[PDB]
Amino acid sequence: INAQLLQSMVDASNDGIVVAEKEGDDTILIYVNAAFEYLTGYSRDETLYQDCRFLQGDDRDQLGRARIRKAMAEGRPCREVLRNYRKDGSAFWNELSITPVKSDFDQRTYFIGIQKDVSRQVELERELAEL
Amino acid sequence: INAQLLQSMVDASNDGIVVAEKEGDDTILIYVNAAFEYLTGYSRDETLYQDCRFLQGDDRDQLGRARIRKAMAEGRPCREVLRNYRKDGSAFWNELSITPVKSDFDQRTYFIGIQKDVSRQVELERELAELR
Ligand SMILES: Cc1cc2nc3c(=O)[nH]c(=O)nc-3n(C[C@H](O)[C@H](O)[C@H](O)COP(=O)(O)O)c2cc1C
Ligand SMILES: Cc1cc2nc3c(=O)[nH]c(=O)nc-3n(C[C@H](O)[C@H](O)[C@H](O)COP(=O)(O)O)c2cc1C
């Protein structure tokens, strides 16, 4: 399995896949896939080198950002569900999966983020409960 | 992005990711990530070098197969929602995504599969429609 096949495996992923490096208090993105651009509504040019905190908008009082911050500082994987907002403003429920990985090229730990949209299932459970 | 990061991105994927090659009427597997092992219940040793039609079991009557065979022969991506069964026999709705790709290393057309489990979503919508 070569890097070309691996790259196309990433581009064919249903969930969004991003890679982010740490720059102090903010971890900025260095790679986004096509699934991330359609999920968030942003393009690769306007999403690189910026922390993914913009997806949270002003909904900054969530339990996930705290567990995410603690796990990354300790090199621990974590999975949290966050309420994020697209460029248009639509709110989508994101089952984010962060995995710190060690790049042997520069011996720098990078962070991989898998974004899965579960907003449709959350709306189903709420609608069935109201019935 | 180097090849080590791309491999870690595949191993961290929630959905199952596999790579298969064409061997006539069959399309045997050559790579299986950890997600495909937990989702299908079959180990890498069992699922390798065999076509993925075994997940269908006895439910081989699905119109998605003819659409899959058409897309792979015409080198076109395809997505189908099929009824597959794990090793325990528990049925699960698999949103399969096949993307034919040309490996420049050997000029052989490989096929990338993305298995997404949507079992409960189908159950929830079915429960919603019956209540409506
Ligand atoms: C690789 C990676 C991907 C991330 N993706 C998202 C995301 O899609 N949505 C989100 O709300 N936060 C995401 N985050 C988390 C934020 O970027 C940020 O690091 C986190 O909210 C830290 O909270 P803080 O603002 O208190 O420091 C991601 C983090 C990493 C490292
Ligand atoms: C990479 C790849 C992954 C596949 N994964 C599945 C799968 O998970 N479940 C399934 O029912 N069919 C899967 N298929 C389709 C079957 O392997 C097979 O091609 C299809 O069922 C047609 O079989 P047939 O020739 O007997 O009609 C996959 C095909 C490819 C190329």
Q: Which domains does chain A have, with CATH numbers?
A: 3-131 (3.30.450.20)
Residue A121 DSSP symbol: H
Residue B19: C-alpha distances to residues A38, A62, A103, B48, B74 (Å): 24, 38, 24, 10, 18
Nearest CB neighbour to B114, from listed A14, A30, A104: A14
Residue A9: C-alpha distances to residues A72, B29, B128 (Å): 25, 14, 34
Beta bridge partners of B97: B79, B114
Q: Give the chain A residue nearest B31 (alpha carbons).
A: A1
How far is B60 from chain A, CA to nearest CA, in Å? 25
Name the residue among A49, A42, A41 with its Cα closest to residue A20.
A49
Lookup: tokens for B19? 């790579």
Answer whether B128 touches A (CB < 8 Å): yes
Nearest CB neighbour to A12, from listed B8, B97, B127: B97
User: Cα separation of B64 and B56, whole Å?
Assistant: 11
Q: What is the 3-state secondary structure (H, E, C) of chain B?
A: CCHHHHHHHHHCCCCEEEEEEEECCEEEEEEECHHHHHHHCCCHHHHCCCEHHHHHCCCCCCCHHHHHHHHHHCCCCEEEEEEEECCCCCEEEEEEEEEEEEECCCCEEEEEEEEEECHHHHHHHHHHHHHC
Answer whether B8 touches A (CB < 8 Å): yes
CB-neighbour burial class of residue B65 (10 A; exposed 0-12, middle 13-18, buried 19+): middle
CA of B103 to the centre of ligand 2 (A): 20
Nearest CA to ligand 2 atom 18: B53
Residue A14 DSSP symbol: S
Name the residue among A9, A25, A67, A129 with its Cα closest to residue B32.
A9
Lookup: tokens for B53? 């039609």
Resolution in Å, one decimal place = 2.8
Q: What are phi and psi of B77, to 5 degrees?
A: -65, 155
CB pairs under 8 A between A and B: 102
Looking at ligand 1, which atom is closest to the CA of residue A82?
A: 11
Q: What are phi and psi of B104, to 5 degrees?
A: -70, -15
B96 CA to centre of own chain = 5
Inter-chain contact A8–B116, Cβ cutoff 8 Å? no
Nearest CA to ligand 2 atom 30: B113
Beta bridge partners of B80: B96
User: Cα separation of A124 and B4, whole Å?
Assistant: 39
User: Cα separation of A126 and A30, whole Å?
Assistant: 36
Q: In which order are the strands placed within the sheet that holds A16-23?
A: A26-32, A16-23, A108-117, A91-103, A78-85
Task: Please state how this structure was obtained.
Answer: X-ray
Answer whether B101 touches A (CB < 8 Å): yes
Q: In which order are the strands placed within the sheet that holds B26-32?
A: B26-32, B16-23, B108-117, B91-103, B78-85
Residue A24 DSSP symbol: T
- Check the annotation: does B115 bind a ligand: yes
**A88 close to A78: Cβ distance less than 8 angstroms:** no
Answer whether B81 touches A (CB < 8 Å): no
**A49 close to A72: Cβ distance less than 8 angstroms:** no
User: Cα separation of A15 and B114, whole Å?
Assistant: 10
Give the DSSP letter string of A39-76: HHS--HHHHTTSBGGGGGTT----HHHHHHHHHHHTT-
Q: What are phi and psi of B23, to 5 degrees?
A: -135, 60
Beta bridge partners of A25: none
Q: What is the dihedral of CA B103, B98, B34, B27, to 10 degrees?
A: -70
A62 CA to centre of own chain = 15
